[PDB]
Paper text:
BgaA is specific for galactose β-1,4-linked to glucose or GlcNAc [lactose or N-acetyllactosamine (LacNAc) motifs, respectively] found in glycoconjugates. The N-terminal region of BgaA comprising amino acid residues 138–993 has amino acid sequence identity with GH family 2 enzymes. Through detailed structural and functional analyses the molecular basis for the catalytic specificity of BgaA is defined and this activity is demonstrated as critical for the ability of pneumococci to utilize complex N-linked glycans as a carbon source and protect the bacterium from opsonophagocytic killing. Further analyses also revealed the presence of non-catalytic CBMs within the C-terminal region of BgaA that mediate adherence to host cell surface LacNAc and/or lactose.
The X-ray crystal structures of a catalytically active fragment of BgaA was determined to 2.7 Å resolution (data not shown) and an inactive Glu645Gln nucleophile mutant in complex with unhydrolyzed LacNAc to 2.2 Å resolution. This polypeptide had five distinct domains, four with immunoglobulin (Ig)-like folds that are arranged to create a nest in which the central (α/β)8-barrel domain III sits. The catalytic site of BgaA resides in a pocket located at the center of domain III and makes a series of direct and water-mediated hydrogen bonds with both residues of the disaccharide while the a-face of the GlcNAc residues lies parallel to Trp685 in a classical carbohydrate ring-aromatic amino acid sidechain interaction. The LacNAc in this complex does not fully engage the catalytic residues: neither Glu564, the acid base, nor Gln645, mutated from the glutamic acid that would normally act as the nucleophile, are appropriately positioned to perform a catalytic function. This “shallow” mode of substrate binding representing an active site loading step is the same as that observed for Escherichia coli LacZ Glu537Gln mutant in complex with lactose. The catalytically non-productive loading mode appears to provide BgaA with its substrate specificity through a pre-(−1)-subsite that recognizes terminal galactose residues and a preceding pre-(+1)-subsite that accommodates the β-1,4-linked GlcNAc residue through primary interactions with Trp685 and a series of hydrogen bonds between O6 of this sugar residue and a tailored pocket. The steric constraints imposed by this architecture legislate against β-1,6-linked GlcNAc, with its longer overall length, and β-1,3-linked GlcNAc, where the 2-acetamido group would clash with the O6-specific pocket in the active site. Indeed, BgaA has insignificant activity on these sugars. This substrate-loading mode does not, however, suggest a mechanism for discrimination between lactose and LacNAc, where the latter is preferred by a factor of ∼10-fold.
Numbering used by the authors:
A (entry chain A), B (entry chain A): 137 to 983
């Protein structure tokens, strides 16, 4: 009766992007916000997502303090009017918010639909009963409040993630209603794999209906791998719901894995028939994989042993603030993969849909974290105050607290995503001390999850393990988890492992080295929480600065590498983020406003430790590489005296996954050096330098301006990689560097264009801080400028006169341009006082 | 004003598939066919394309004779009713036929729109003035006549290619109205390449309008590579047309080439504005490439010297008859590429849109041929009788003959396709003898083409060069061409080259070896036109049979390989086709009905010479291979006596592109043999066997049943390929072999499922001819069965009782199943008397 193309059309039509044509106003009056035909002339017309905090100036007196990036919050309304199409008049309508920060209220046509306090969890409302009859204008108004301090890092404020509308028949698969399981995958993988599917179907009509479900599995961007599999026709009564179940067999599916960069994904297509008529159809993304984790050997994925080469990531995107964007998140995660990262932790809140989808697409394992606090709170306006209050959401179950409801709906949202392998129910929960209350709480939370999904490790991250020998009442909380995350606790691992032989252990937060891109200080010394005025609000890109409780990248990695029972780590952090500028944390009159912890700066530019990790985690067969530091501009006596040794020599270091590196100064060899090859006690091969604490090769080089070139070779002496640093002359030009020749004309895709200050030969000037002004013409929109400097208080957005400016920092920065909905092109031009201007052009059109 | 997605939607909506819901009736009455509300109950309802001849039984008295496959033609009507949508009431409507064989008439609402005699050329009609006002039902009726004999090969009858409807604004780009040129590509290729575009725009309205065109170039399935480039706004008067022109620059485009299997293609998007409103948009496929051809060095593509490794291909697809199908043509051309083919010749008629598009997509050079005759005719009902008659098409220009009009519109259709590099204006034109009439004709035809397109070689194929020394009046015709095709004229090449130093020469038809898959005869001897009753209507798969005027694959290839000034060849033929069963040509009471010339049989199964060519044309780096012949079942004394030498030994031969092959009999070596490496006088490297006439390695093997295994090695002695033949026991089962696990549910995609007769160990029985019956269940449709046997008179289609049956031939055959528009799956089951049945399942759904 119904064609495949009609089914695919219905799937498409079921969900619409509801982001366009909102009006926004800070401190708006409630009565005006919610009422029909309000005067919106003093409101800002815009397309969502929109984080309103990122447009503020930095404020030394901000109640967020510098931990929150010194950007104020407040309260605001957003409103939108819409009519249902005539064909949709009798349909069920659900409105979904992927994240609204925070304490939100949604009104439809003057009536309160719900209050949702959580700032990060997706939530949705069935709004059908609130809509106007006969297709007259409806008004949605959303109140968002960011009362500070509410957060230990930059949160952003408002509707910072997508909003979608689902329009379905009265009989439909409920929100997150699909469950897909493959309980015998490991045994069945070389033949027919039984794929058990379940659909929660809802009849919102006031008549009984005959119900059939029909399923097909297809390769995502591939071909069908099953026929149609139908359930038995049965009655679903008026206002009731039911779970239909079926088993489909897929022959030799490709297994999802982190060991490729385009892992295999599948989609389940569900068709719903009401009295023999096709009324609903949807798809659900999933993949085939299995895993195992033992105390002494750690983790394995589809039978292959691996370690979590992981990063902790906050949700902000630098100059974009909290605004979620598919392309921004893709760039960041792709950059993490290029470093050899295979896992991410969403610290410390539910992920966007974009993050989770990209992780499944790129092959990254995900630990998704529900809570930064329990009932104790960490900041007076955080989620702590809601944690034990009764959930008032109209779909909450009897007795559910906010914590029950939020945790349940997060798990239901993500329970088919193959990237997700762990659910965290908290990070550094001070009150989780093994008292009777915290014991009751941990068991309640574990059970909420296990009542939805038993296939993923329930965990928590805890720093209590780093104090003394690590033992204490908190151990009883850890016994209730499937896996136990240690924050900065390497020193107590051996003792805790002997005490708890059965625990699945990993580092949920590690290292916490602090680094400023292109800035160097006392390479010969490890500096602990060094925040004196002589540091001038910078940390060392040699990677030798770390906080009091942290470790260098080398110390935390070599520990992990050498211990098979510590299953991996999530580095604090993969990228810089706005706020927590430790070691100047909450020194509010200093200029700092963003973090030093990242391996990559907020502008998306790698610090040198990126290449350290790459050298350790990416095999020489996959991507032979070599990387030199520091720069080669040592004219300035003050810069050089902080770096040069007693003989005036610069320590030049190479990270490489090759067998040897030879360093040349102006064409003359300074000597070939060879990594020492070694084995872990369980047989894993690794390389190190001159001793166990050095993963680089090092030369002490007397300074002669020119070119330093590193030649990396395989064991047989063939060159497989090279890197080169050059002494720059004085600034002569701004140069622009496109990442993309073209992007999609969809009003969503965007591109990162780097700007650099270069001398007259085209060498980047590594000390340069020149002010750059930007012009944009054509079919694009400037949406951000950044240079990653922690101590900068420059705007990320346009100046008050509409202009776009940003200094270089150590030679570099980035401008971010978003496409419009019109095909064509845009040209970005950069200017700087007394330097040559430059422009580049990026085309826009079909994806 | 207008978004990219709206532009792409308009492009899509401009052209629709008009193939569904036609009614067909052989010998229908004209008055009933054309009139409104005819009773169609005695008509067959069907979706086009539909070749009605392929459903006939073979007929010994067919006026087609066996050269035409002994399948009758006749005359038939097709009719379809349709209403214009309300939004389309004032639009221009053009109806396009990609091919109707032949002598067609199209009626719209009782009125004759046109008579088009050509059976292969695409044609279209503006039917706007014939349509009903206010959106009442329109009737299209198409009369097709296949009065025989009209053809030297199987033509098919009726509407055997797609029909499309274009619905556009009154102001629009005319049919084939786009020209795209890159005249400085070779010079500009490393920077910005100027892409000159021209659009013929037509104003069919009776008011003047202001006209602007806007262009963008995009990578096909990639991203934009230009912005929007607009023309100056100017008036286009009522009922007039004009040519707009613009230049776009594309930076370093990827060059289209035959040396990869996914060459780079681009699309030009044109937007047309009428009084500032976007009213028309379309795209045109093209690619960037340049070529050169010199008398002494032959052809080069983008600066790389190559030879045409070419095949001649007829339009029929075996059991599909003349029905054109994208998937069938894709399979065939992909199979040609896997053999090392880089060029095709469309013998001897314009190509379908599918052929030309697939050739651009797979990287095959195309010579498209317009005529099998001029004014002389070859068969009484062929095109000869129309060639010099005045074109009556409503869009013909004053004084145009049918030959002018057909040649012009073919060139206009294909002038942007990067695969097309040569236009042929005839093949073996007997009357092109250099008399005054034929001289006038050749110059007229060359000029028709050069008035449209100067970038492609105008050519002809001629066998007059093979008689005597090759000289004669025909030389004067050849002097008028850009390139001269020699049919079977290798023996006179040296003399003709010395006589005409400036000619660009190639073999437009070569070899014409005759072969039956799996049948072997006197391998020690070259057999010339051997058609005695002892041959039992079979030819030798050793490749040693050829027609009187032909050559073996080896003799024609080694000639080409050794002569740089003979630019390549088009083998007669790439695949078998229905009709011309030489050397039993027009011996009408014999059983033969299909050709022996193909390298691949009509069922798509390679003959052994496929692997000969592959061994010569595909590099060992690209695909190391080895291939053994004959089979290893020599029990039957009569079969063996035609093959075994005087000592009873079987000559076993290996084709390979490797350095050496070692043959093993039942695990025991029969000796490693090594190809002799040699060079052409111009330095091209090649391999040969024991002497210059042997491209294989050969062993004379005393027959012991079991396994023969060939191990092919590189120079250093590493194994890079192997092949294996096994003695089969008696038939025990039918086995089915899927090419596809799944296909699209679009009612167009189809799949080839091979069936084989196997013994109880799963070895193919190479002599087996068992009758197989097929059942199909689920979402598919059987559309063909075939086994490639020339002497078979079995149906390709269903039996008169609706059943599907076909014998194996030498162990094998194929069944072809088409998808429907519903997702799901189909199961094909095969049965055979006293053997085990087998089934396979193919899924259908998203592409
Ligand atoms: C007062 C003090 O020094 N407290 C520290 C904590 O700040 C620290 O927690 C870490 O703090 C950083 C920001 O500086 C970030 O929030 C990390 O996620 C968090 O772990 C803790 C680590 O054990 O030590 C305390 O003593
Ligand atoms: C009577 C005779 O033998 N004539 C032959 C031609 O048939 C032949 O032309 C070829 O014929 C084959 C089919 O047998 C096919 O049509 C080829 O395309 C065509 O070239 C011709 C070749 O020179 O020789 C004649 O003498």
């Amino acid at each position: 009766a119904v064609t495949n193309e009609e089914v695919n059309q219905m799937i498409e039509d079921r969900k619409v992007d509801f982001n366009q044509n909102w009006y926004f106003k800070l401190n708006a009056n409630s009565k005006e916000a919610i009422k029909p035909d309000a005067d919106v002339s003093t409101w800002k017309k815009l397309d969502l997502p929109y984080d309103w905090s990122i447009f503020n100036d930095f404020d030394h007196e901000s109640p967020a303090q510098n931990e929150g990036g010194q950007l104020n919050g407040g309260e605001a309304w957003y409103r939108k009017t819409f009519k249902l199409d005539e064909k949709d008049l009798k349909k069920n309508v659900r409105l979904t918010f992927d994240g609204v920060y925070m304490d939100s209220q949604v009104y439809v046509n003057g009536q309160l639909v719900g209050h949702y306090p959580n700032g990060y969890n997706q939530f949705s409302y069935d709004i059908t009963k609130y809509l106007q009859k006969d297709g007259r204008e409806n008004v949605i108004a959303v109140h968002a409040v960011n009362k500070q301090p509410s957060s230990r890092w930059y949160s952003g404020s408002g509707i910072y993630r997508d909003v979608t509308l689902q329009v379905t028949d009265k009989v439909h698969v409920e929100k997150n209603g699909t469950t897909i399981l493959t309980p015998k995958l490991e045994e069945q993988q070389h033949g027919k794999v039984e794929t058990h599917v379940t659909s929660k179907i809802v009849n919102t009509d006031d008549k009984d209906h005959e119900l059939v479900a029909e399923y097909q599995i297809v390769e995502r961007g591939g071909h069908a791998v099953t026929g149609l599999v139908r359930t038995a026709s049965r009655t679903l009564k008026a206002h009731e719901s039911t779970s239909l179940d079926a088993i489909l067999e897929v022959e030799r599916p490709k297994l999802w894995t982190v060991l490729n960069d385009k892992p295999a994904l599948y989609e389940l297509i569900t068709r719903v028939y009401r009295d023999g008529q096709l009324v609903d159809a949807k798809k659900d993304l999933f993949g085939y994989r299995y895993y195992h984790w033992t105390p002494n050997e750690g983790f394995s994925l589809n039978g292959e042993r691996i370690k979590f080469h992981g990063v902790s990531l906050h949700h902000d995107h630098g100059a974009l603030g909290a605004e979620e964007n598919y392309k921004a998140e893709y760039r960041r995660l792709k950059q993490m993969k290029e470093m050899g990262v295979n896992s991410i932790r969403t610290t410390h809140n539910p992920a966007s849909e974009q993050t989770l989808q990209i992780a499944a697409e790129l092959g990254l394992l995900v630990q998704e974290e529900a809570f930064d606090t329990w009932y104790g709170g960490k900041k007076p306006y955080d989620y702590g105050r809601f944690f034990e209050k009764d959930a008032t959401h109209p779909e909450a179950r009897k007795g559910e607290k906010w914590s029950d409801f939020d945790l349940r709906t997060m798990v239901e949202r993500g329970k088919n995503n193959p990237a997700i392998f762990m659910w965290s129910i908290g990070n550094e929960i001070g009150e989780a001390n093994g008292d009777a209350h915290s014991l009751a709480t941990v068991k309640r939370l574990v059970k909420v999850i296990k009542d939805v999904d038993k296939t993923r490790y329930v965990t928590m991250g805890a720093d209590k393990f780093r104090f003394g020998n690590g033992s204490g009442g908190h151990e009883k909380i850890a016994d209730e988890l499937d896996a136990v995350g240690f924050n900065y606790s390497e020193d107590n691992y051996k003792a805790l492992r002997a005490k708890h032989p059965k625990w699945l252990i990993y580092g949920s937060q590690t290292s916490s080295a602090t680094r400023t891109r292109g800035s160097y200080y006392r390479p010969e010394r490890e500096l602990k929480h060094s925040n004196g005025p002589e540091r001038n609000y910078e940390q060392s890109d040699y990677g030798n600065d770390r906080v009091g409780w942290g470790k260098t990248a080398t110390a935390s990695w070599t520990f992990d590498r050498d211990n098979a029972g510590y299953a991996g780590q999530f580095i604090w952090t993969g990228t810089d983020y706005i706020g927590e500028p430790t070691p100047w944390h909450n020194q509010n009159q200093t200029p700092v406003k963003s973090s030093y912890f990242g391996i990559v700066d907020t502008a998306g530019i790698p610090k040198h430790d990126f290449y350290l990790y790459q050298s350790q985690w990416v095999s020489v067969k996959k991507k032979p590489m070599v990387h030199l530091l520091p720069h080669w501009n040592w004219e300035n006596k003050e810069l050089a005296s902080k770096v040069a040794d007693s003989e005036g020599k610069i320590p030049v270091r190479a990270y490489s996954n090759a067998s040897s590196v030879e360093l040349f100064l102006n064409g003359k060899s300074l000597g070939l050096k060879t990594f020492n090859k070694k084995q872990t006690s369980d047989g894993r091969t690794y390389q190190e330098g001159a001793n166990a604490n050095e993963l680089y090769l090092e030369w002490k080089v007397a300074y002669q301006p020119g070119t330093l070139e590193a030649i990396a070779r395989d064991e047989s002496g063939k060159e497989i990689a090279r890197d080169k640093i050059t002494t720059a002359g004085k600034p002569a030009a701004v140069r622009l560097i496109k990442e993309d020749h073209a992007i999609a004309a969809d009003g969503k895709d965007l591109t990162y264009i780097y700007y650099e200050i270069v001398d007259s030969q085209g060498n980047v000037v590594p000390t340069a801080n020149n002010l750059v002004r930007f012009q944009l013409h054509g079919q694009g929109q400037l949406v951000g400028v950044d240079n990653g400097e922690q101590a900068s208080r420059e705007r990320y957005k346009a100046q008050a006169d509409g202009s776009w400016i940003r200094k270089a920092f150590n030679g570099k920065g980035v401008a971010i341009v978003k496409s419009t909905e019109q095909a064509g092109k845009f040209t970005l031009t950069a200017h700087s006082d007394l330097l040559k201007s430059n422009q580049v052009t990026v085309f826009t059109g079909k994806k």
